[PDB]
Coordinates of C-alpha atoms and ligand atoms in Angstrom, one line a residue:
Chain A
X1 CA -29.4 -0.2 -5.3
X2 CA -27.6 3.1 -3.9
X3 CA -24.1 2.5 -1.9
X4 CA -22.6 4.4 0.3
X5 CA -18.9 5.1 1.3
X6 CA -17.3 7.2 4.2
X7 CA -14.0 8.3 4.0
X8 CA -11.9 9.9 7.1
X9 CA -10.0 12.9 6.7
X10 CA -6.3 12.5 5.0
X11 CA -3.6 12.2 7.7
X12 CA -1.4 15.3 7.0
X13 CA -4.4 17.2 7.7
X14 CA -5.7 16.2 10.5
X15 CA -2.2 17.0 12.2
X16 CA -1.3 20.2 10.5
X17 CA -3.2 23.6 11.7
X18 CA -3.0 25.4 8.3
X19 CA -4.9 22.3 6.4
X20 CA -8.7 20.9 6.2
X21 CA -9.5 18.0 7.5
X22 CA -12.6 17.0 5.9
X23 CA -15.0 13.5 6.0
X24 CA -16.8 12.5 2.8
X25 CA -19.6 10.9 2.1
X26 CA -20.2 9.4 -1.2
X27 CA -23.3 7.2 -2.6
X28 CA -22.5 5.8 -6.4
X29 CA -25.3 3.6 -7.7
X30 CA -27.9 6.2 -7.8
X31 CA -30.8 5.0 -10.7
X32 CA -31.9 7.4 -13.3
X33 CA -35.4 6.5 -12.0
X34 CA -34.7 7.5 -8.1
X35 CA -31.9 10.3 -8.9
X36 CA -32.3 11.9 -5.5
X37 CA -29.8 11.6 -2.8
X38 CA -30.7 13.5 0.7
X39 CA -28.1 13.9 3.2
X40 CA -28.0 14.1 7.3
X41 CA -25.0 15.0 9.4
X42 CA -24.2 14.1 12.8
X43 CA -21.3 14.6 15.2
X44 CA -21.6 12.7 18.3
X45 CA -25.2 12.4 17.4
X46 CA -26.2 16.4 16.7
X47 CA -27.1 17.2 13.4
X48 CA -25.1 19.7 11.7
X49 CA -26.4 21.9 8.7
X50 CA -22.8 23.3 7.3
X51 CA -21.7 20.2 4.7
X52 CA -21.0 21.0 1.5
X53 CA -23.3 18.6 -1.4
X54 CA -21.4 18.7 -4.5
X55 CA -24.5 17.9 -7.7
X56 CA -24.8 14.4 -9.0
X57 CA -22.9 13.5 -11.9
X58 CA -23.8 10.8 -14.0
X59 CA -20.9 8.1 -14.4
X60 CA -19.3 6.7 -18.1
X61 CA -21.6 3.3 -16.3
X62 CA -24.7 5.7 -16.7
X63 CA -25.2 6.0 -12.5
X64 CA -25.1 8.6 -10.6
X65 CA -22.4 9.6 -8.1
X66 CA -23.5 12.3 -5.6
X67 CA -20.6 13.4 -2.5
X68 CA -21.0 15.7 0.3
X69 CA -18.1 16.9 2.1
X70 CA -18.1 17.4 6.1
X71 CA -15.3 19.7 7.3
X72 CA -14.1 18.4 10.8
X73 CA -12.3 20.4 13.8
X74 CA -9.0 19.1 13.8
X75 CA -9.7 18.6 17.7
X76 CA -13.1 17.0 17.6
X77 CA -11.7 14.5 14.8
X78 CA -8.6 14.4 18.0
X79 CA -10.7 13.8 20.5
X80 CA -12.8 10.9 19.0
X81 CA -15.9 12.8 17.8
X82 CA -17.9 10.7 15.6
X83 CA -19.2 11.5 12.2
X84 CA -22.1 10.3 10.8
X85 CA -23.5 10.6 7.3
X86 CA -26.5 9.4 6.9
X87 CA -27.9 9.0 3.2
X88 CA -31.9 9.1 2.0
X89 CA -32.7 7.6 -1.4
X90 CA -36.3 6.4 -2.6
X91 CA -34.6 3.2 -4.5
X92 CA -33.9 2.0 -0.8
X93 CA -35.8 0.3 2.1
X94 CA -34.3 2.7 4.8
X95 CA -32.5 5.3 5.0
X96 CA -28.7 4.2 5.2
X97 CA -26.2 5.2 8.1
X98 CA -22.5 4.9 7.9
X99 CA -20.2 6.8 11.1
X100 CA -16.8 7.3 11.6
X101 CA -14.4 8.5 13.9
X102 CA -10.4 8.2 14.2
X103 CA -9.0 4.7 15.4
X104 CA -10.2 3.7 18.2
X105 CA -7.2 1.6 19.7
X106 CA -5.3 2.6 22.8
X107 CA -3.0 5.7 21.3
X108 CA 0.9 4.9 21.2
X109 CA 3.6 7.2 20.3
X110 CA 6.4 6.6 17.4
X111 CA 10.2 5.6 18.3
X112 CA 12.3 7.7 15.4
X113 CA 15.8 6.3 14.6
X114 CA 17.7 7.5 12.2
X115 CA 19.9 5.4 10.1
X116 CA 23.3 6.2 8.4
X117 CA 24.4 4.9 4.8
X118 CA 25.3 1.2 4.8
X119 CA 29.1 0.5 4.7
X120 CA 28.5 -1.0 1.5
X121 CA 27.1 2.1 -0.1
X122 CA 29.3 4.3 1.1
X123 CA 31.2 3.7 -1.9
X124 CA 28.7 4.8 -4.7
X125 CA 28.2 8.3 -5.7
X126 CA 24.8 9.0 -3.6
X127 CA 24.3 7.3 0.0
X128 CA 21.0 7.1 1.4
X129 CA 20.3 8.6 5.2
X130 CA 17.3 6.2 7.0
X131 CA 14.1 7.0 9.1
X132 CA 12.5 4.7 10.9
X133 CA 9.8 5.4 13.1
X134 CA 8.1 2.3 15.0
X135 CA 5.4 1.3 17.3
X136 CA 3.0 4.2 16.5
X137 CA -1.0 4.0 17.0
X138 CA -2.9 5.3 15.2
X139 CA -1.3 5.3 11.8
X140 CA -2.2 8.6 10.7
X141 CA 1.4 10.2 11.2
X142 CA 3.6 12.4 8.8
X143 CA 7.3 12.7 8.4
X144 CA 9.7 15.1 7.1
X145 CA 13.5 16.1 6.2
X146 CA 15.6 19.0 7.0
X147 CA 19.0 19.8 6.2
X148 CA 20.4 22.6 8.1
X149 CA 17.4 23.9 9.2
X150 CA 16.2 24.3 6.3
X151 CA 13.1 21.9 4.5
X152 CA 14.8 18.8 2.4
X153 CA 12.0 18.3 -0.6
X154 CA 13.6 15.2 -2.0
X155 CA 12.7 12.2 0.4
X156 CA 10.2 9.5 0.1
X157 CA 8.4 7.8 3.0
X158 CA 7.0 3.9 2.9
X159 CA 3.3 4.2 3.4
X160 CA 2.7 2.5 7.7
X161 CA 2.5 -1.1 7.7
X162 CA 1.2 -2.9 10.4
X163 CA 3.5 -4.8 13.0
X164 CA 2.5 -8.6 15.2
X165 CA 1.9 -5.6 18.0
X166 CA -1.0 -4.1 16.4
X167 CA 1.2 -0.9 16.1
X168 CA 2.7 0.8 12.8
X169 CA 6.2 1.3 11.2
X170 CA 7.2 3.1 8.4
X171 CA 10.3 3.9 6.8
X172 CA 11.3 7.4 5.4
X173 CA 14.2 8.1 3.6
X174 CA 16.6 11.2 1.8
X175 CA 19.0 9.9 -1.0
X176 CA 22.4 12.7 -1.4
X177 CA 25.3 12.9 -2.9
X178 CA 28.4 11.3 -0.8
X179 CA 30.2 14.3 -1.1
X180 CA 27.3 16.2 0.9
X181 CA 27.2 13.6 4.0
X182 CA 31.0 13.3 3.7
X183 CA 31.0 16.8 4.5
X184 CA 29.6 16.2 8.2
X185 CA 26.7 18.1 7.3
X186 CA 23.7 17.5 9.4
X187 CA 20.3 16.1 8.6
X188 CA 17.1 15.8 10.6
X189 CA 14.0 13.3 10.6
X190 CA 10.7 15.3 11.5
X191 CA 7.9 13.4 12.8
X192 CA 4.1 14.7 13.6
X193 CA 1.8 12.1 15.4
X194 CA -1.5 12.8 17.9
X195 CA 0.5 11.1 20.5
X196 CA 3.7 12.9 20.4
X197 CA 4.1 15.9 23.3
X198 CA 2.8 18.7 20.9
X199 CA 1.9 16.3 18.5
X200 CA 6.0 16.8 17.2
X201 CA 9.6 14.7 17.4
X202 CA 12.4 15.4 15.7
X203 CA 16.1 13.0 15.8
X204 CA 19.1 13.9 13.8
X205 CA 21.8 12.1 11.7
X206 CA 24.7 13.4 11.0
X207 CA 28.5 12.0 10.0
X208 CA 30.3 10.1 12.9
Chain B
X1 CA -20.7 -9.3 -15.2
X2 CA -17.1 -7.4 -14.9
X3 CA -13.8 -9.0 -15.7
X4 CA -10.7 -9.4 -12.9
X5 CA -7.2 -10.5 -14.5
X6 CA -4.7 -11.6 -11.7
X7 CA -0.9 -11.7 -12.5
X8 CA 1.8 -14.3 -10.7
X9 CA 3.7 -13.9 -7.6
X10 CA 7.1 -13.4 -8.2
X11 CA 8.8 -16.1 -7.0
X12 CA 6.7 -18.8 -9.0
X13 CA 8.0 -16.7 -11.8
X14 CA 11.6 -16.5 -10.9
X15 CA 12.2 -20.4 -10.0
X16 CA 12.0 -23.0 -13.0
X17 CA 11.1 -25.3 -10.9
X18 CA 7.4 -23.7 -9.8
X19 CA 4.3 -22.6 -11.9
X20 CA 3.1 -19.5 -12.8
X21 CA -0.6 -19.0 -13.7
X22 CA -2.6 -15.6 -14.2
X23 CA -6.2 -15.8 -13.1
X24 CA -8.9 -14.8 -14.5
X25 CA -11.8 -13.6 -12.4
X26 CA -15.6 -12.9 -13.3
X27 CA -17.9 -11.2 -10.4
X28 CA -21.3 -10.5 -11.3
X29 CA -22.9 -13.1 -13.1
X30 CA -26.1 -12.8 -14.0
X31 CA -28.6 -16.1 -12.5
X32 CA -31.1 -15.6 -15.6
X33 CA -28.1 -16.8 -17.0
X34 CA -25.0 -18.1 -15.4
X35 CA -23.3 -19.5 -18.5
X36 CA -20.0 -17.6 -19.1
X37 CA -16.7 -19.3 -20.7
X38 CA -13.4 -17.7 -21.6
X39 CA -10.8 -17.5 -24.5
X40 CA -7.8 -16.7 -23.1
X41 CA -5.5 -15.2 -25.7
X42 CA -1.5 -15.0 -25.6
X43 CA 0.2 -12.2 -28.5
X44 CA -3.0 -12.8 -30.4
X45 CA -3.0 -16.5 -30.4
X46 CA -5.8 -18.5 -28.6
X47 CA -5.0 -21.2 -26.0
X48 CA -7.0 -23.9 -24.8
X49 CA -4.9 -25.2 -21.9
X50 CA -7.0 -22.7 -18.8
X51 CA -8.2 -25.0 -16.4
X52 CA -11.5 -23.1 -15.1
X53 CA -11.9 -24.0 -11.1
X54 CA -14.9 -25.6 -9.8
X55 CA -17.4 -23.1 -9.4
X56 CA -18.5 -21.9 -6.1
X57 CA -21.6 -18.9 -5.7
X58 CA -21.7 -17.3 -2.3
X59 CA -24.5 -15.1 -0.7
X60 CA -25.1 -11.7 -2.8
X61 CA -17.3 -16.5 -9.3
X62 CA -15.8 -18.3 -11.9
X63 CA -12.0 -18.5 -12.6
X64 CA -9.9 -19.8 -14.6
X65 CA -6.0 -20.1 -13.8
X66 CA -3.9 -20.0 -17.1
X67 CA -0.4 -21.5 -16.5
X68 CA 2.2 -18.9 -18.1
X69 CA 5.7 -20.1 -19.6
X70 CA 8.4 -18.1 -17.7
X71 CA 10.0 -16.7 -20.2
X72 CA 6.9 -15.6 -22.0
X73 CA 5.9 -13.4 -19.1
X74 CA 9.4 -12.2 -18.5
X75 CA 9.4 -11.1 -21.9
X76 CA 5.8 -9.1 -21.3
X77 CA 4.1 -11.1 -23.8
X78 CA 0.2 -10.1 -23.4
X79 CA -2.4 -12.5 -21.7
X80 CA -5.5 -11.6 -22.8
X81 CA -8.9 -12.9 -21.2
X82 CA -11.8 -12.4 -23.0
X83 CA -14.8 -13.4 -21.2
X84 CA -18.7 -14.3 -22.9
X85 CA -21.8 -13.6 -21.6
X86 CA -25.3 -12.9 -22.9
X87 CA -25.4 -9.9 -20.2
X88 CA -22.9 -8.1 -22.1
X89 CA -23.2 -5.7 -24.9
X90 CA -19.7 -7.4 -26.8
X91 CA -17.8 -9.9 -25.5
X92 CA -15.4 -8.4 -22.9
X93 CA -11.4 -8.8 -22.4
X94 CA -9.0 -7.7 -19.7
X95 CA -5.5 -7.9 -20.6
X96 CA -2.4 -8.1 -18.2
X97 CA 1.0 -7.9 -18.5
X98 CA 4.6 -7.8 -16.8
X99 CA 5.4 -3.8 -16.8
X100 CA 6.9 -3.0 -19.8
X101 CA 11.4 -1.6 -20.1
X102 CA 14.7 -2.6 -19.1
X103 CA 15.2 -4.7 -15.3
X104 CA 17.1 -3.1 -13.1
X105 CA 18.2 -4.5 -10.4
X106 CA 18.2 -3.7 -7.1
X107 CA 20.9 -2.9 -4.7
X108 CA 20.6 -4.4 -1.1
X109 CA 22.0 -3.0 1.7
X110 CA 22.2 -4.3 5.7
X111 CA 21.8 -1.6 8.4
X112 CA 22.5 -2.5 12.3
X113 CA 20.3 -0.9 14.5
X114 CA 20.6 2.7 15.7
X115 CA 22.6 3.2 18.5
X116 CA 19.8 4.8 20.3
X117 CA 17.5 1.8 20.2
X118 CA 20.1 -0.5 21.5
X119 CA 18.9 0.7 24.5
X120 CA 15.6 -0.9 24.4
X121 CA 14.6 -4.8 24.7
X122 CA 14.1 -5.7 21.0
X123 CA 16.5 -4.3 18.2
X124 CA 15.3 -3.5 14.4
X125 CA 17.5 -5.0 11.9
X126 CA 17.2 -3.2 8.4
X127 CA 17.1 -4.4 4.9
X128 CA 17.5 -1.4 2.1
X129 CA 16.5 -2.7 -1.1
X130 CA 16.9 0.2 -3.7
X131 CA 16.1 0.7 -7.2
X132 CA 14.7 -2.0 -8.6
X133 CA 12.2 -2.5 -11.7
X134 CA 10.0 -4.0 -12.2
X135 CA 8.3 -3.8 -8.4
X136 CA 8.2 -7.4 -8.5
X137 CA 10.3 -9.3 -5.8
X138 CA 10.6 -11.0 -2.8
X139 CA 12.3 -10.9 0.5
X140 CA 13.6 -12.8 3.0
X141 CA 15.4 -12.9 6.3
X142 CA 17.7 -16.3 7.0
X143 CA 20.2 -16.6 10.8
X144 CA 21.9 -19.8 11.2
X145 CA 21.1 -21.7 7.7
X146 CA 17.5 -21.5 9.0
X147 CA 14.4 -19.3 8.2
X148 CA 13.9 -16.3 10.3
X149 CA 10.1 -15.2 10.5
X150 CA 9.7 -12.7 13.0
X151 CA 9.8 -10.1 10.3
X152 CA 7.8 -7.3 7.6
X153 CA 8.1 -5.7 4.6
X154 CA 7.2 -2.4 3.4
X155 CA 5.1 -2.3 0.1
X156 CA 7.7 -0.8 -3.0
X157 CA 7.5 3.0 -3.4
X158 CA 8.0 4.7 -6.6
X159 CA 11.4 7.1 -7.0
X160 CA 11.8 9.5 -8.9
X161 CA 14.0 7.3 -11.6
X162 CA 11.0 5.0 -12.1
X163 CA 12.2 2.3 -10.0
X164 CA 11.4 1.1 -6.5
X165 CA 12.8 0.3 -3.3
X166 CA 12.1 -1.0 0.0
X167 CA 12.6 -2.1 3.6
X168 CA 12.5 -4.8 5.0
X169 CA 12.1 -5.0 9.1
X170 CA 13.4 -8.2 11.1
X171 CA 13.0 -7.9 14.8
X172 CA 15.3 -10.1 17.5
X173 CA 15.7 -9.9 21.0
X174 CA 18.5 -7.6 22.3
X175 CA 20.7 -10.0 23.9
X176 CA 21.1 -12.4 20.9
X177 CA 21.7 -9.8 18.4
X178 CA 24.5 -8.9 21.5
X179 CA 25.8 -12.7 21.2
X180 CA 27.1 -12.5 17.9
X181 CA 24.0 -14.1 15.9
X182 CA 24.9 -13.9 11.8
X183 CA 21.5 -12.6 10.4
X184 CA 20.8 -12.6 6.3
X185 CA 18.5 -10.5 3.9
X186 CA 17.8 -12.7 0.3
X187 CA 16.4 -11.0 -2.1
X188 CA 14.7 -12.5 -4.9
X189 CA 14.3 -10.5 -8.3
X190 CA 14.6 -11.0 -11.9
X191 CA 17.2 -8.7 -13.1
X192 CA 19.6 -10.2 -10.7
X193 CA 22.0 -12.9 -11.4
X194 CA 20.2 -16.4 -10.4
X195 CA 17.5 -14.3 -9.6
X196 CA 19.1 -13.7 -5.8
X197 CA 21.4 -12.0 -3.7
X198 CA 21.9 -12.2 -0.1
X199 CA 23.5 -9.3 2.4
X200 CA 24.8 -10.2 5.9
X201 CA 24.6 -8.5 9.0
X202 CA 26.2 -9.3 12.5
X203 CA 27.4 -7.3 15.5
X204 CA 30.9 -5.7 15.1
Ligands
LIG1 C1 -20.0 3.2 -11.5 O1 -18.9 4.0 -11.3 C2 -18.4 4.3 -10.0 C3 -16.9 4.3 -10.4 O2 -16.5 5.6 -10.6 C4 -15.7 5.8 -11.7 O3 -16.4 5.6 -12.9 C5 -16.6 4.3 -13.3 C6 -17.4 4.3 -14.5 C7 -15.3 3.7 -13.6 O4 -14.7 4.5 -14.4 C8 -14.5 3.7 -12.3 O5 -13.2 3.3 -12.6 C9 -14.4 5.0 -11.7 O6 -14.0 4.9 -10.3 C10 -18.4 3.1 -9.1 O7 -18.3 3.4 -7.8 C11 -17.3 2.8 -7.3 O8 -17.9 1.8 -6.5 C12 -17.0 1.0 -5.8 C13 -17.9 0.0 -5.0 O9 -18.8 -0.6 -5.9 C14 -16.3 1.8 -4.8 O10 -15.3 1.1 -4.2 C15 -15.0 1.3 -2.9 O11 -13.7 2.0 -2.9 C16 -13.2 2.3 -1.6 C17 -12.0 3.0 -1.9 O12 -12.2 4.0 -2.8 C18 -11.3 5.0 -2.7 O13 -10.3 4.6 -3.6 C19 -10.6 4.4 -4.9 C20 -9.5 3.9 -5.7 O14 -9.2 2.6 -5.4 C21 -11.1 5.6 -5.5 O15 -11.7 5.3 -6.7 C22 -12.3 6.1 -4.6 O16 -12.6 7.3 -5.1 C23 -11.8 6.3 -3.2 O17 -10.9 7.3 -3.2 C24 -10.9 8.0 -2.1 O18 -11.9 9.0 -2.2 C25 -12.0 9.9 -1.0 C26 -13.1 10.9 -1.2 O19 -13.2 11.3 -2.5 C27 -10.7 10.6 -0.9 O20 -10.8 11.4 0.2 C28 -9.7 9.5 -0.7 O21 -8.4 10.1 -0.5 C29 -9.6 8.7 -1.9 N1 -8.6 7.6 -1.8 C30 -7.8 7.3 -2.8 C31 -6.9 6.2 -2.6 O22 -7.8 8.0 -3.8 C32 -13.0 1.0 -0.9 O23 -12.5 1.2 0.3 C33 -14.3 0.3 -0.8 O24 -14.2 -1.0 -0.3 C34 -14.6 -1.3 0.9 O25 -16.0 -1.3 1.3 C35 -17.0 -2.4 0.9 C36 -17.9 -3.1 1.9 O26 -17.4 -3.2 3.2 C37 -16.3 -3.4 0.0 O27 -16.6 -3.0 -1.3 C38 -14.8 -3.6 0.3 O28 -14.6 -4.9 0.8 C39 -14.2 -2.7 1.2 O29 -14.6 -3.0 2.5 C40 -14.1 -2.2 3.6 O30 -12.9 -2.6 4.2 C41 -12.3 -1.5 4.9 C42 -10.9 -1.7 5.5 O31 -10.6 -0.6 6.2 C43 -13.2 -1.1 6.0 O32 -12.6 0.0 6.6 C44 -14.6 -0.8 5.5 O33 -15.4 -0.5 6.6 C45 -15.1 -2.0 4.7 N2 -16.5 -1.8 4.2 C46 -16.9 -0.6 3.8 C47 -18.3 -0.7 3.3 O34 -16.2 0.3 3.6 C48 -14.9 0.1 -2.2 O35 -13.9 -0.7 -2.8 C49 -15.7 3.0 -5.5 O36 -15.1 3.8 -4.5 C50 -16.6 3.7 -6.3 N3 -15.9 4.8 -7.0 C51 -16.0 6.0 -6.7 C52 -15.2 7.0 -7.5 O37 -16.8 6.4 -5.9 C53 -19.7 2.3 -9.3 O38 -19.7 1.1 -8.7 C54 -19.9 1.9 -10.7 N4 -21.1 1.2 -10.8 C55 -21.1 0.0 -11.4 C56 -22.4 -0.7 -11.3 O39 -20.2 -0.4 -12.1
LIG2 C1 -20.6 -9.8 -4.6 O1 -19.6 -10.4 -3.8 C2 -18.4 -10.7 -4.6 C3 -17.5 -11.4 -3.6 O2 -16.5 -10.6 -3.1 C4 -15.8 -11.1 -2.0 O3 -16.6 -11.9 -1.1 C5 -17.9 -11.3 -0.8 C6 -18.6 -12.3 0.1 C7 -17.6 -10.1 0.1 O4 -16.7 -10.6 1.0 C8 -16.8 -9.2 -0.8 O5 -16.6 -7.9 -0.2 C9 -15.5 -9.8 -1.3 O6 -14.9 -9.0 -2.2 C10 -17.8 -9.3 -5.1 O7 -16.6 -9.5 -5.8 C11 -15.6 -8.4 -5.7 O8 -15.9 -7.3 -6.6 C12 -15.0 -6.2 -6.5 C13 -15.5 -5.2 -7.5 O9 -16.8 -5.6 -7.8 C14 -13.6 -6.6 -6.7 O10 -12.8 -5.5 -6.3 C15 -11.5 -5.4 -6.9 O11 -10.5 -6.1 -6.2 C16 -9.2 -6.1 -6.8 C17 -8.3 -6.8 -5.8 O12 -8.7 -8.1 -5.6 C18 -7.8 -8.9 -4.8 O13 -7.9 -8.6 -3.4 C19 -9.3 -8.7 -3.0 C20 -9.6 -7.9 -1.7 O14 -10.2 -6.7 -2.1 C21 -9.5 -10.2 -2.9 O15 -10.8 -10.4 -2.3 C22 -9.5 -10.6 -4.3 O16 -9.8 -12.0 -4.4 C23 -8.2 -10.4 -5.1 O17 -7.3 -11.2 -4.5 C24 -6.3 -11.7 -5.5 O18 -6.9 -12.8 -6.2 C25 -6.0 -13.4 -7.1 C26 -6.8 -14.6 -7.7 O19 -6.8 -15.7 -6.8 C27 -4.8 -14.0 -6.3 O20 -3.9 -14.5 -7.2 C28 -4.1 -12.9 -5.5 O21 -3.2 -13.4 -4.6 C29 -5.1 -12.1 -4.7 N1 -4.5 -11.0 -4.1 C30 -4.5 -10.8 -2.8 C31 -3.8 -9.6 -2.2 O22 -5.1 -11.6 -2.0 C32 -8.7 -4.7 -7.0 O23 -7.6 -4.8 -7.9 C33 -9.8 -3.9 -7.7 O24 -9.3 -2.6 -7.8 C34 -9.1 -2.4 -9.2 O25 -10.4 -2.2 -9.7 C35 -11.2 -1.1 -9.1 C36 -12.4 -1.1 -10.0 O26 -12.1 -1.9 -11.1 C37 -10.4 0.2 -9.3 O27 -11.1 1.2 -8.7 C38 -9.0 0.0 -8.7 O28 -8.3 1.2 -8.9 C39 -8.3 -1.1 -9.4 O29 -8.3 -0.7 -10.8 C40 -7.1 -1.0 -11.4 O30 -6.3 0.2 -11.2 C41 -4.9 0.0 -11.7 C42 -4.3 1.4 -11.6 O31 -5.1 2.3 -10.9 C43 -5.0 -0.4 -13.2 O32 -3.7 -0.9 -13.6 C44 -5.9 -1.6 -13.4 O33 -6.0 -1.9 -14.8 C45 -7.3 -1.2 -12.9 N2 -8.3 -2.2 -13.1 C46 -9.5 -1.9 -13.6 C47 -10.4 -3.1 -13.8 O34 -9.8 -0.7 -13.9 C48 -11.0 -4.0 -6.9 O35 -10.7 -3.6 -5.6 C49 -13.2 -7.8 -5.9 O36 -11.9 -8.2 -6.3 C50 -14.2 -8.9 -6.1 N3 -13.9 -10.1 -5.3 C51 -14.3 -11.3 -5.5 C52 -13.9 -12.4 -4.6 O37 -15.1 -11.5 -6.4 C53 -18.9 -8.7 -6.0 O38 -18.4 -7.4 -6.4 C54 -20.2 -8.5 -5.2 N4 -21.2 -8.1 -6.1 C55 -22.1 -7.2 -5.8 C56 -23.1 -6.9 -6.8 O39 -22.2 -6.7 -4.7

């Protein structure tokens, strides 16, 4: 029969103010015979009426997929609020009910170090300047580089793992030519996290 | 019935001395009729040396693990399983492979930890490994001729070249990073020579 998936909002925009933060709910399995999919919101148990139901489209596996999209307050998803879809479908017993919310494991905030080029590398023609932020709960968290003051668009970032203390690390990284850290230009790891003091950190790295 | 075609873990492939096997994985077999065997295919040639596992249902799988030569699946050569059963349409086959184009191999570097987490009670010792293909590898933190396994290992990300890096964490107590312990990073990885490297790290 019908299942059901609920998906939390992605993590850059539950922290940043100019995105959406949105929950989804989609049900795949959906028989030719019982096509009908009804939805239910809820937020902390209240029913809301403003979701968005996209029309079921019938999959290459000749099922039907059928998603509706819950946009969240970036402070309710904050402070814990819990979502619940709940899905109504005639090929099914009961109604099903799925909820989520944001972790819900005691909050910790991320340690940022930065890291300059190995010894070893500092003889090849681009060096790479390290990020690492540690012990953060919950693992939503995003990271960013700046060179003098100014946005750095060619980084990469390890997706969080998960450490023996039940918090996250991650890696982030920003690959230049020697010349350009040589130079004793200086570079800056940006960090946004619930649990930072305005949800913001920032270290900098920078030629001894 | 849907067809799952696991590939080896790297260091069974890198070391002569261990096996590598692919496994291939059926998960919805039909009880009107449970009868499903393979032909598991190699550049077009059929092999008859799988070794399917005893079969075990569970509340709501049948395998069978092909042992690979090594230098066939270095050299990409294409395992092909094609699974039969009457709940399917034509006989169905999932194909897996080594990524395809030229090793490269990756570059490992030792980091000490930042000056301002020396101030804390554990210290983060850092193993770079950069731009590698394929993503296959393993790594490894050694002090003293002895195993260290107090550490964690990012997944590979993608760069922009193609190839892959990644870090590898190992965490010690501040005091005996302060004694002068000699810690070690191995990587393991086939476009390497010997298939390993190691980079050392020890207070200055
Ligand atoms: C018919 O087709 C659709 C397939 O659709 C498409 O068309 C078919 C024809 C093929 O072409 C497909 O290739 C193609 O996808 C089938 O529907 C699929 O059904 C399976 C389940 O049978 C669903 O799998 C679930 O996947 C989620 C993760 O899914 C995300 O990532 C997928 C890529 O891997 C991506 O495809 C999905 O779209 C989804 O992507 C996310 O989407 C949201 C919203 O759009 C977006 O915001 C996200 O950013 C985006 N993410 C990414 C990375 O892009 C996976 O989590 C589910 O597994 C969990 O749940 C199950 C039970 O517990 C169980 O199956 C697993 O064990 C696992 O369990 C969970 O463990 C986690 C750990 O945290 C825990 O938190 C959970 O609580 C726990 N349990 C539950 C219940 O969650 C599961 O794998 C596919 O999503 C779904 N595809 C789509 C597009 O919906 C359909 O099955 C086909 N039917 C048949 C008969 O073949
Ligand atoms: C009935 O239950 C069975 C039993 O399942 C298991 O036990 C039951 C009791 C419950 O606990 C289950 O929740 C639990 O799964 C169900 O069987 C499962 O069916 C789903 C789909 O139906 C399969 O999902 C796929 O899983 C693989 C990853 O699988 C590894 O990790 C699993 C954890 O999720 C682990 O459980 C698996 O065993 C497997 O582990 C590996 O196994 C090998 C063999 O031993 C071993 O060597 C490895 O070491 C081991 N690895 C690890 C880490 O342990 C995942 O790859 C699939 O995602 C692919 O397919 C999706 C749909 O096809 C697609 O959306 C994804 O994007 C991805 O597709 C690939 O995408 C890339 C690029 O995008 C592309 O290159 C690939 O070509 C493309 N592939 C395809 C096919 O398109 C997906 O998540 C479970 O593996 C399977 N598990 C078992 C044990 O059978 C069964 O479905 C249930 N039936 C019903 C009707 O409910």
């Amino acid at each position: 029969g019908p299942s059901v998936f609920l998906f939390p909002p992605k993590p850059k925009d539950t922290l940043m103010i100019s995105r959406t933060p949105e929950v989804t709910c989609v049900v795949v399995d959906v028989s030719h015979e019982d096509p009908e999919v009804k939805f239910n919101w809820y937020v902390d148990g209240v029913e809301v009426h403003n979701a968005k139901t996209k029309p079921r489209e019938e999959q290459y596996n000749s099922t039907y997929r059928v998603v509706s999209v819950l946009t969240v307050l970036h402070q309710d998803w904050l402070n814990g609020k819990e979502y619940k879809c709940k899905v109504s479908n005639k090929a099914l017993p009961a109604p099903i009910e799925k909820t989520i919310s944001k972790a819900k494991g005691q909050p910790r905030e991320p340690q940022v170090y930065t890291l300059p080029p190995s010894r070893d590398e500092l003889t090849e023609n681009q060096v790479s300047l390290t990020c690492l932020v540690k012990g953060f709960y919950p693992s939503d968290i995003a990271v960013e580089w700046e060179s003098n003051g100014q946005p750095e668009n060619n980084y990469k970032t390890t997706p969080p793992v998960l450490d023996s203390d039940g918090s996250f690390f991650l890696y982030s990284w920003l690959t230049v030519d020697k010349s350009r850290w040589q130079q004793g230009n200086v570079f800056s790891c940006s960090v946004m996290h619930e649990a930072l003091h305005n949800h913001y950190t920032q270290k900098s790295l920078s030629l001894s």
